[PDB]
Amino acid sequence: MSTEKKQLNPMRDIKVQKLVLNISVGESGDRLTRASKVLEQLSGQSPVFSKARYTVRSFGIRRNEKIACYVTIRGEKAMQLLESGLKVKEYELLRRNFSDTGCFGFGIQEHIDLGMKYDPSTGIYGMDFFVVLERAGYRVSRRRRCKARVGIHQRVTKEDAMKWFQVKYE
Amino acid sequence: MGRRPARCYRQIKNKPYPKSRYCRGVPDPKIRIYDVGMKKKGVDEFPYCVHLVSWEKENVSSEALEAARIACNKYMTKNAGKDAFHLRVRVHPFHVLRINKMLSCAGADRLQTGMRGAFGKPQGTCARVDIGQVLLSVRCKESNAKHAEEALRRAKFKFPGRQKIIHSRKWGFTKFTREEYVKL
Amino acid sequence: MSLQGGFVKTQKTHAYFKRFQVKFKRRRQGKTDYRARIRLTNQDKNKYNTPKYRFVTNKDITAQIVYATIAGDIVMAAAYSHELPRYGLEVGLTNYAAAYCTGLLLARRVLTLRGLDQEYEGNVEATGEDYYVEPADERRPFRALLDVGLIRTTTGNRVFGALKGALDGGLDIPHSDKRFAGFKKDEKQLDSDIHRKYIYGGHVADYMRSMAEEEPEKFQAHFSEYLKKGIDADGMESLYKKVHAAIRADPTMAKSTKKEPATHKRYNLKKLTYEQRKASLVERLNALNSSAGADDDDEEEDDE
Amino acid sequence: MPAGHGLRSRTRDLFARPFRKKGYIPLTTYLRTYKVGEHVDVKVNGAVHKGMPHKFYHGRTGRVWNVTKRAIGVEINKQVGNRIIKKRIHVRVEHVQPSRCNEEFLQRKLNNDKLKAEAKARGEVISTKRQPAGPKPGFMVEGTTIETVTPIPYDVVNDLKGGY
RNA sequence: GGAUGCGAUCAUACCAGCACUAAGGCAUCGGAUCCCGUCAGAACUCCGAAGUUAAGCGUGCUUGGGCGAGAGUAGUACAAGGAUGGGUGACCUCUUGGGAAGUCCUCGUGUUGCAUUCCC
RNA sequence: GCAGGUGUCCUAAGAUGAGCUCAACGAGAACAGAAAUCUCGUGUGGAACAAAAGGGUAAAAGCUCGUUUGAUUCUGAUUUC
RNA sequence: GUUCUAUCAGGUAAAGCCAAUGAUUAGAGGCAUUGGGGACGUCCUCGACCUAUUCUCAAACUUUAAAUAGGUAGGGGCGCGGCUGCUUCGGUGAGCCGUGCCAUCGGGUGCUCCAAGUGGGCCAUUUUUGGUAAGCAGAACUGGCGAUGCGGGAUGAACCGGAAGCCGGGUUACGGUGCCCAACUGCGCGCUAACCUAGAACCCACAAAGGGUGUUGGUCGAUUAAGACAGCAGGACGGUGGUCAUGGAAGUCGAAAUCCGCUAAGGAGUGUGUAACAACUCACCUGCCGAAUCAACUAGCCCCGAAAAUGGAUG
RNA sequence: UCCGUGAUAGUUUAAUGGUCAGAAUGGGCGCUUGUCGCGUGCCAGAUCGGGGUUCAAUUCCCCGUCGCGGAGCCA
């Protein structure tokens, strides 16, 4: 329903909902969740434990147990992450990783970034940095009481996404 | 095939069970193909339908559905070929015959004592072909109507419940052939 | 074509449907829970409704006293923080002191001593006080209970200040003190236990003295000056106004009013049928043409 | 197998609701409180799971006899068989519906008596109906309650149904 | 003529789409030292007006597919009572009191009770 | 007679309150297929409730979190039996 | 107890659930390997298999809406005054007591004591569930037998009439009126000739799928004195021994193809042929004859299918 | 035909508490030995067919094919 043709912006322009940096490997294969250390450094705040629910067929009977780790960041902290993260995968590159929904994600070792290797006791190769982009009004699908779906009208587009991010430092 | 004669199962008399997910061990259905002829067309080139309609509401045996069809089907191919018009058989074999099977010969037959006693191993199935239902529905083009008519006449000597041939029409073939070209 | 979203709804209609008539407009809007509603309503104590978030929020608050009847609920009194500057006050209408005073204003307004029928003894006013742990006479609460609505039991919080303004207002509302916004948390004086501060009117006072630029008109004591004017006794309002001209009106209302069906569906259908017979391509949603004349009918004639 | 009364056995209206009645019931039914001598249906909402009587009772109309906390006692009489007694049923107001028939009736009674007063100060119809009412001694009721609950232990249907 | 709170009727109250509570009778919105909270004010929440009408809340319309309700169009199924009524029979039938159904047209993209009460 | 369950298992698999709302599908994430995980959008009872069937319920009765002990003693009008 | 309200059996179209199985149109996207190509100084496209989604034809659980139908439920008021309650030293009614006032049936009927066979049924009708079925088994709802005469059904526990003190007379019910046997060899009309056939119901009275130019009857189409239908009789040259195919068609194994000159009529032919070659009839047309004909639907009865045991019957 | 009773690798035959399966022989590979054999190190199962219950079934139910035992009167 994209209504652009008016007299526009400041509510329309994109913002960062979140950056989630998530590891998926498992326990035992590298450790407890020790690339939490590496997350800890790159992002700047502590990652939180990922448990699983549902199926595996492959070892992974324990269910409730540590297997993964994540950092959902946002404000300045997400952006500050983007700046370092944004520059490492090369550019430019590419429409395919963007969804139509207007989010984009990439992989690489935590060791990419400025950072000491020396502090991370382990490095671990890859897992999604995910960037959630959205308009101001999101708060309607998010907030509890008066949830309303986000309309086609509101929802970010890959074109819109590429533009706002391509606007900045890549 | 191995005997039980169909009169016993002819009457619409007992409660209707066709439920496959509870009724375990249910054997092969038939007819092997229900609509016979083309299948590159639907009704188009065939501006005549002929039907066989039941006078008598009854349970018709699964093999009788094949037997009535096969006599009709050779008349179709032996007088109008492989990829001709299209016939449809339109009542199908819902009614699972459980019913006493496998008798023995002591002073037991009924093996446990005399009993017998449901959880019977299944024998076959019948179709409920009720009054005025269209058992066979055949779309044809007019010169070959008389060919479908002998084929329906051969069909009726091979099920129990008496039927009449009719050239079938809903909106004629003469409100269709107006209403078609009035809204284009 | 493909396509998602619509298609996974329009087929599974019957489900839809059910989703809109399981609950109605205040739940569809997402406003009122009908399990908290039932907890609080069954007894005839009235609902002491105090809204404050995704509603009226970050700007004003309201307290309403609601009873049941055959027609619908029925508010017996209400107070809005926007009426609170009438009694002199001009500092912020969303804060703890505003909420506190808005609850007194509803509570003073509900007795106000009404109707022939009266009631101001044993002992309304319980002053604009300062306060300690609820002094009543004293043991049984009735004719108001707190309907927090969507708003939380979050320990030491502004819904409780509204509740405290009810209590020091001559309403008696049920209580025990173990998540509550106690005494100084309006401001008042305080404090005890595992929860903390021992200031909160007087919030902003602590802040303001940590220097920086913000709102005009001073300081910590300006809570005290016009909490003190809201300690005075002075029922009741609202209001005197001139009524009302003719008619309705309004330029917004007008460029919206009124009706138009039938006729307008007939003008639009005429436009559609003329648009078809002058071209023939697609209809409205989504397909057909060869060659039509409205509506369900056209599709049946384009098969055979 | 002996017969019983599987208290939960055969239940499709008695617990299912139409498409139009599905989902949570609005709490106004849960809130509704009645006065003694109200005539109220018993007929469960199926979408409330507690406070229900034993399912056979549903579609009978009872008199509100007394109340205990939250649920109410409503008096009903069982039906069919032999010598059957009044029984009292404990039911919350979620399954108990006010009789509109009884309200309509109450109204139709007042209408009748507005006219009785008018037509006895300047009007004429009946005469004979004026002769009973005016005499009577009244009143309420429990002699005639025991009178009610002795022929509804019915007579000839009991012998008729007592063999076949 | 009506937006803002609490609700009744809970498939006439939808999915979808187009105008509007609004220069001092909202929500988006800004500060997050804070009570509160999170992993992370995003939610949550003390605080609060610079912007916005762009929404949400909700207001004028759109029946489009959905359906309540009804109008014609399918008296057809079905069934209660009764027949030395018919039929070899499964079965039918008259009489007595009753009678869904699909299509098309239609109405309908709310209604109602208490509030705060408002621009004209 | 058809169809199929209970003779266990549970101090949390109870209680309450705040706070949340699905299953699932598409789209996105180097590697992973079982791949969880992490995200977004759509999402009304199709999920979830130990256990048959069945029926029920969406700020819940379901989810999450803390706390708690009422699986306390004694009495019972009445329904089932 | 009809009328008011409730809500409910119930099972067809639709919805969720699910559907065997076969009959599928349009059209997006999965997967796999292979093949082909222009476009341009790889791309992109196409093809070989699967699934969305538009979606037709047919039963099956739940729900609509049942329609239904029986069920099945139900048929005093006011004021005054005291006292009370639950739920803010807070709002209210309700309860209670006291006192006054004002208001289509028709004994089908309540309570108590003490006693009985039981505490094993049957059948019919309706609705069923099992069972091939059964004078089966097992329920539901009812009427009867049991425990019910008398009259009809040849006889006959439960079908019909009918519920009975005894007797007398009258009239009837069911059912019947040729004789046996009271009472019609009744009236108007029509069908059947098989001794069909003398029969509601019955373990008891059989008769089917299917067939029948027997006969009657109803209807519709076409053909008719611009002469029909049938029969009998009579006319048909030439292209050219029709093109294919094949020992061979050549009218006449099989398969093109079916026109015309010359004509008033006159088809490249209807059945009979010899290994193959050998003739006759016939399409169409005409006469003779003179009146209805033919086609087709529908229906009745009858006929057929129709074989069993000591001796023939609808009593 | 009724009541009882079993089955696990090529073959004969152990075993469990619901989360874990063996042995011996036979056989497949080396070494003995001139060569085989005697002997000596090494190795290797859809627990009968079948469906169900459960967090997890070789193990707990139900059915069946086979192989067993034990009954079957008064004619």
Side-chain angles (χ1 to χ4, degrees), chain A residues 1-91 93-170, chain B residues 1-82 84 88-184, chain C residues 1-113 115 119-137 141 143-304, chain D residues 2-4 6 9-135 137-138 142-164:
Chain A
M1 58 164 158
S2 210
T3 204
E4 198 185 81
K5 197 168 290 179
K6 191 216 181 164
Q7 271 114 201
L8 238 96
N9 49 305
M11 309 315 303
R12 282 257 85 196
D13 69 343
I14 197 167
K15 63 168 188 75
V16 291
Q17 182 72 357
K18 71 184 175 187
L19 197 173
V20 190
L21 180 291
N22 168 33
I23 162 174
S24 295
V25 176
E27 57 101 44
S28 281
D30 85 315
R31 72 295 99 150
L32 175 61
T33 188
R34 29 60 192 172
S36 53
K37 286 172 183 186
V38 104
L39 308 190
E40 172 88 12
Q41 291 186 290
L42 198 181
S43 62
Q45 88 204 57
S46 314
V48 295
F49 275 88
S50 324
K51 73 286 146 276
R53 181 190 166 187
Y54 323 102
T55 319
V56 300
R57 163 235 86 173
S58 181
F59 207 69
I61 77 179
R62 302 84 84 194
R63 258 55 171 227
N64 307 49
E65 78 163 343
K66 22 84 247 109
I67 276 146
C69 253
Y70 58 124
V71 194
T72 72
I73 203 156
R74 174 213 81 280
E76 296 169 328
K77 310 196 286 166
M79 292 291 283
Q80 182 180 329
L81 175 50
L82 270 300
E83 293 163 47
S84 302
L86 297 180
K87 207 169 181 179
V88 195
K89 23 147 192 187
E90 303 182 297
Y91 187 76
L93 308 181
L94 56 171
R95 60 183 183 183
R96 208 262 78 90
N97 303 70
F98 288 73
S99 167
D100 272 286
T101 314
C103 301
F104 69 91
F106 47 100
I108 217 58
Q109 186 180 28
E110 183 258 31
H111 194 265
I112 88 70
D113 284 321
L114 187 286
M116 293 83 196
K117 190 232 90 174
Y118 266 97
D119 196 29
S121 179
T122 196
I124 203 70
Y125 196 29
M127 48 246 353
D128 60 290
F129 281 84
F130 218 60
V131 175
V132 186
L133 298 181
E134 189 39 54
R135 295 187 168 104
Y138 184 51
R139 199 205 190 274
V140 188
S141 188
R142 166 68 184 172
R143 68 188 188 223
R144 321 290 192 187
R145 134 78 169 145
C146 210
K147 174 175 176 185
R149 58 167 74 95
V150 273
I152 303 78
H153 311 240
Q154 196 163 3
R155 236 264 128 284
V156 176
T157 66
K158 73 74 152 288
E159 300 293 342
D160 291 319
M162 180 188 70
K163 181 168 289 173
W164 289 116
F165 272 73
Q166 181 178 290
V167 174
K168 58 173 112 153
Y169 283 87
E170 36 182 35
Chain B
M1 279 303 294
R3 301 174 184 194
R4 288 208 206 118
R7 325 100 180 307
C8 306
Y9 311 112
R10 172 163 182 189
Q11 306 183 305
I12 294 179
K13 186 189 194 181
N14 320 84
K15 217 224 258 64
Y17 307 85
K19 295 181 172 183
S20 56
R21 292 181 161 178
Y22 295 94
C23 304
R24 308 180 187 123
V26 163
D28 324 11
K30 291 178 186 176
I31 317 187
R32 319 188 225 211
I33 51 160
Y34 299 2
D35 302 14
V36 188
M38 264 199 280
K39 41 177 42 56
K40 295 93 202 164
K41 259 95 136 175
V43 180
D44 44 79
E45 213 198 69
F46 315 122
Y48 257 84
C49 197
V50 299
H51 283 183
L52 192 59
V53 291
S54 200
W55 196 262
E56 309 207 358
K57 70 296 106 200
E58 299 189 357
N59 303 294
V60 183
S61 77
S62 195
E63 216 73 54
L65 274 302
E66 172 76 315
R69 161 265 176 153
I70 206 160
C72 184
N73 280 193
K74 193 160 287 145
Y75 209 86
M76 294 175 65
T77 190
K78 200 171 183 178
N79 194 169
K82 182 180 141 289
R88 161 166 235 98
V89 183
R90 182 254 194 66
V91 200
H92 299 306
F94 318 131
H95 193 35
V96 185
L97 305 180
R98 310 164 283 96
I99 287 175
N100 282 286
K101 302 182 56 164
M102 294 300 293
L103 293 174
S104 63
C105 295
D109 335 294
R110 298 182 183 174
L111 296 174
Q112 291 177 335
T113 58
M115 296 300 293
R116 290 182 183 174
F119 294 97
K121 308 186 188 170
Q123 186 259 309
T125 177
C126 292
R128 296 216 162 164
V129 185
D130 285 74
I131 192 169
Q133 283 208 29
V134 184
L135 188 53
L136 299 99
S137 181
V138 191
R139 289 67 156 223
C140 202
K141 52 181 86 278
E142 193 168 18
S143 191
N144 304 106
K146 297 219 152 193
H147 153 84
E149 155 185 301
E150 174 58 6
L152 296 175
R153 203 191 66 79
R154 293 194 175 263
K156 66 79 180 173
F157 289 98
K158 308 194 123 300
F159 42 57
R162 199 163 93 87
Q163 311 201 4
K164 170 163 170 84
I165 305 170
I166 183 172
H167 319 333
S168 59
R169 280 171 163 163
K170 272 191 179 180
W171 307 132
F173 288 127
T174 45
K175 280 187 168 193
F176 296 113
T177 55
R178 295 182 177 202
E179 277 77 297
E180 287 155 27
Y181 292 108
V182 160
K183 201 112 137 221
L184 302 167
Chain C
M1 65 286 279
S2 326
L3 212 70
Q4 296 93 27
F7 276 2
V8 205
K9 298 186 278 199
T10 47
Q11 207 245 337
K12 287 260 79 297
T13 216
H14 185 87
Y16 280 86
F17 316 107
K18 194 177 69 62
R19 124 88 134 76
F20 313 138
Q21 301 291 153
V22 171
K23 60 81 229 101
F24 63 104
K25 282 282 187 182
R26 284 280 123 150
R27 189 70 177 146
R28 182 293 215 156
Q29 281 162 342
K31 179 68 241 1
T32 304
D33 176 34
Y34 301 158
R35 299 313 178 92
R37 186 157 170 106
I38 193 47
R39 298 182 272 126
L40 295 65
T41 207
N42 199 164
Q43 30 285 341
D44 202 0
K45 294 171 183 183
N46 300 141
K47 323 202 291 155
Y48 178 88
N49 215 320
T50 187
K52 85 84 187 165
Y53 167 52
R54 184 45 269 263
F55 212 46
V56 64
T57 204
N58 290 353
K59 158 60 177 36
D60 265 270
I61 58 266
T62 182
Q64 299 103 7
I65 196 171
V66 182
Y67 181 22
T69 191
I70 195 170
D73 293 9
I74 175 143
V75 7
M76 312 301 281
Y80 301 84
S81 43
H82 172 257
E83 300 169 295
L84 198 77
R86 301 299 178 284
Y87 294 96
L89 184 273
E90 191 179 301
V91 218
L93 263 39
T94 194
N95 49 62
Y96 268 94
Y100 178 61
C101 295
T102 302
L104 271 97
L105 188 60
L106 167 57
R108 253 75 155 148
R109 274 185 177 182
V110 68
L111 299 170
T112 204
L113 324 176
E119 322 308 50
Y120 212 53
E121 295 286 11
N123 183 213
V124 199
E125 43 183 290
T127 202
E129 77 178 311
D130 208 88
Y131 178 86
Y132 218 126
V133 60
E134 276 63 356
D137 38 9
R143 85 156 46 219
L145 166 272
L146 176 65
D147 182 6
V148 82
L150 292 160
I151 304 126
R152 311 186 55 170
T153 184
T154 284
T155 189
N157 193 276
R158 193 161 88 298
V159 285
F160 298 106
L163 167 147
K164 296 286 186 188
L167 271 159
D168 299 302
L171 271 177
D172 186 4
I173 296 194
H175 51 278
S176 127
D177 216 357
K178 43 170 170 171
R179 291 197 200 153
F180 264 7
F183 202 353
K184 218 171 225 239
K185 239 169 175 81
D186 312 294
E187 201 163 336
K188 305 195 192 179
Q189 203 172 33
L190 257 178
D191 190 55
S192 185
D193 222 65
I194 195 176
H195 285 286
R196 51 181 50 104
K197 299 288 184 197
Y198 216 142
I199 55 123
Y200 226 117
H203 42 290
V204 162
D206 208 353
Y207 183 55
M208 201 281 148
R209 182 176 66 159
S210 193
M211 67 140 291
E213 292 168 62
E214 186 44 287
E215 76 143 342
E217 204 39 270
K218 304 189 259 60
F219 65 179
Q220 333 90 320
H222 268 188
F223 111 70
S224 183
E225 280 73 284
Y226 273 87
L227 206 164
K228 169 66 216 85
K229 181 75 224 61
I231 299 182
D232 310 307
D234 331 314
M236 221 87 251
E237 239 180 294
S238 304
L239 63 66
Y240 168 35
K241 90 85 46 91
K242 196 63 254 192
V243 57
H244 221 26
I247 227 155
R248 312 320 34 184
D250 253 294
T252 331
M253 314 214 68
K255 177 239 70 192
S256 242
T257 38
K258 180 94 183 168
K259 63 87 244 72
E260 296 287 292
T263 309
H264 211 42
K265 169 180 154 180
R266 311 297 163 105
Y267 215 89
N268 314 331
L269 184 42
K270 153 203 179 173
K271 201 297 202 168
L272 173 56
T273 322
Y274 207 103
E275 197 80 71
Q276 289 178 343
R277 287 293 192 150
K278 172 243 74 189
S280 291
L281 207 282
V282 289
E283 304 184 282
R284 300 171 179 244
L285 301 171
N286 292 289
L288 198 47
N289 285 240
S290 32
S291 50
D295 286 283
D296 290 290
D297 301 86
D298 303 317
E299 203 81 85
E300 194 182 267
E301 269 47 89
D302 241 338
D303 188 61
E304 218 194 335
Chain D
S9 238
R10 198 193 173 228
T11 46
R12 263 54 181 277
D13 155 53
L14 316 170
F15 259 33
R17 304 276 76 108
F19 305 135
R20 300 185 192 76
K21 304 175 191 174
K22 280 273 285 177
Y24 201 60
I25 193 179
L27 60 290
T28 193
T29 314
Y30 205 118
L31 174 54
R32 177 71 189 157
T33 199
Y34 292 125
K35 298 180 272 62
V36 193
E38 289 196 50
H39 292 69
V40 285
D41 210 65
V42 178
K43 183 86 194 295
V44 292
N45 205 47
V48 176
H49 253 175
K50 185 43 64 199
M52 294 179 123
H54 312 251
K55 313 174 190 198
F56 113 40
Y57 306 109
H58 296 339
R60 283 57 264 171
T61 312
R63 28 256 173 221
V64 172
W65 153 95
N66 195 249
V67 53
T68 188
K69 192 221 302 146
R70 314 93 49 103
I72 202 160
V74 144
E75 184 212 83
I76 51 161
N77 26 284
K78 191 177 193 190
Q79 278 75 27
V80 174
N82 322 78
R83 296 224 156 163
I84 56 189
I85 186 71
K86 79 184 208 167
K87 297 276 285 178
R88 173 268 235 166
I89 255 71
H90 182 102
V91 56
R92 287 268 297 130
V93 59
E94 287 273 78
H95 322 99
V96 183
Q97 304 296 305
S99 191
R100 183 170 180 76
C101 178
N102 290 79
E103 285 280 310
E104 175 65 62
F105 207 20
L106 168 56
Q107 200 185 5
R108 186 71 172 108
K109 185 64 171 170
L110 182 64
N111 302 137
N112 219 140
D113 282 63
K114 180 283 194 177
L115 195 282
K116 301 167 189 188
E118 186 186 55
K120 181 81 165 31
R122 211 289 305 233
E124 279 304 303
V125 264
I126 38 184
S127 295
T128 301
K129 288 284 177 195
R130 313 161 158 108
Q131 302 181 88
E142 277 305 285
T144 192
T145 298
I146 193 68
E147 292 181 68
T148 304
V149 168
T150 45
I152 75 192
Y154 25 48
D155 46 316
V156 290
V157 71
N158 130 129
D159 46 296
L160 165 284
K161 240 278 157 299
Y164 286 120

